Amino acid sequence: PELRKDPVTNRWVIFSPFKSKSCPFCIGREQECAPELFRVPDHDPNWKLRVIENLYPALSRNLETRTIVGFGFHDVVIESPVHSIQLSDIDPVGIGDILIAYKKRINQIAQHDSINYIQVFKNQGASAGASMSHSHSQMMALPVVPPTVSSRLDGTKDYFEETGKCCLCEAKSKHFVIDESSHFVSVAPFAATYPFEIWIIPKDHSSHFHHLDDVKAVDLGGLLKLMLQKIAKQLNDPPYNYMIHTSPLKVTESQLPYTHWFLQIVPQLSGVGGFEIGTGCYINPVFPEDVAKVMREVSLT
């Protein structure tokens, strides 16, 4: 039983020692959705993916200007034409296309000075927040830098000032390696917030996700797919969430040395209670050392 902390989360977690507990988005029903931003391949009727506006946005894109107006961008990335397909089934190249699509939309949004952070995330399973069965992910552009981002900046800065190094650049030395690709490495975070949480860290120190090129997008697409399929097997296809942790749009040169983006995957295996809500501190039932060994021994035969 012990408390562990990491510059990235900049918060203590308690470790105290597992399985899971057509449609308007399909090709042909495009008018059934909200205005399209673009698709892939470009303007092709036989599309592999498309990004559209979210019909009922959390933040409205039509309000550009103690409280702040709800302006922001809430877009939806339809990951496939086929309804029965799950992001995990798509081929490495097809995922890379999804990853490149994010980059594209991120670059467009970056043109607005009113935006300070963009959150790319994926929900699979109703209990994990996924309102629809069709494979899809989302993008939320916020006018403010979110708490996790602020905390991260603070933590990685404190660590950088004391060691002169970027915690994520030491992924293989600070965390527990599960798998590794050509440009990325997946690990079980040392001070992981959730049981069986997995981070996919780029091996090259880059401060923002959209700095990703086509070669790395396919290479990342493969590691992501491998991590999702192993999760699905070892944990019995549990619902899950993955989110891209990148830098704010106005990130400073001064912050660059210790700002390194990554992708977080969290399989839903348990909920929270009054302790968590009240403290912001979580209780992880499984150490990452064990999650690492289990995920390394899992096979897809």
Is residue 169 close enough to count as binding its own copies by CB under 8 A?
Answer: no
Q: What type of residue sits at position 132?
A: M
Q: What type of residue sits at position 124?
A: Q
Q: Is 281 annotated as a binding residue?
A: no
Which is the catalytic residue, given 74, 136, 175, 210?
Answer: 136
- Residue of 105, 285, 103, 111 whose CA lies nearest to 212: 103
Alpha carbon distances (Å) from 84 to 22, 88, 220, 224, 259 = 9, 11, 23, 19, 38
Q: Which segment (84-92, 102-110, 128-136, 240-248) binds Zn ion by CB under 5 A?
A: 128-136
Q: What type of residue sits at position 82?
A: V
Helix, coil or strand: residue 51? strand
Is residue 81 close enough to count as binding its own copies by CB under 8 A?
Answer: no
| Paired strand residues for 266 | 241
What's the DSSP call for residue 81?
A: S
Among 27, 85, 110, 283, binds its own copies (CB under 8 A): 283
136 noted as active-site residue? yes
Q: Is 260 annotated as a binding residue?
A: yes
Map tokens 């029965």 to a residue.
Answer: 84
Among 15, 25, 176, 261, binds Zn ion (CB under 5 A): 25
Contacts of 240 (CB under 8 A, 6+ apart): 124, 125, 128, 228, 231, 265, 266, 267, 268
Which one of Zn ion, its own copies, none is in contact with 247 (Cβ closer than 5 to 8 A by kind)? none
Catalog residues that contact its own copies under the rule CB under 8 A.
1-6, 11-12, 14-16, 57-60, 63, 66-72, 117, 119, 121-123, 127-130, 138, 140, 142-144, 146-149, 151, 190-191, 241-245, 264, 266, 271-275, 277-281, 283
Residues with a catalytic annotation lie at 136
Catalog residues that contact Zn ion under the rule CB under 5 A.
22-23, 25-26, 83, 134, 166, 168-169, 205, 260
Annotated binding site: 23, 26, 32-34, 54, 83, 123, 129-132, 134, 138, 166, 169, 205, 260, 271, 275-276
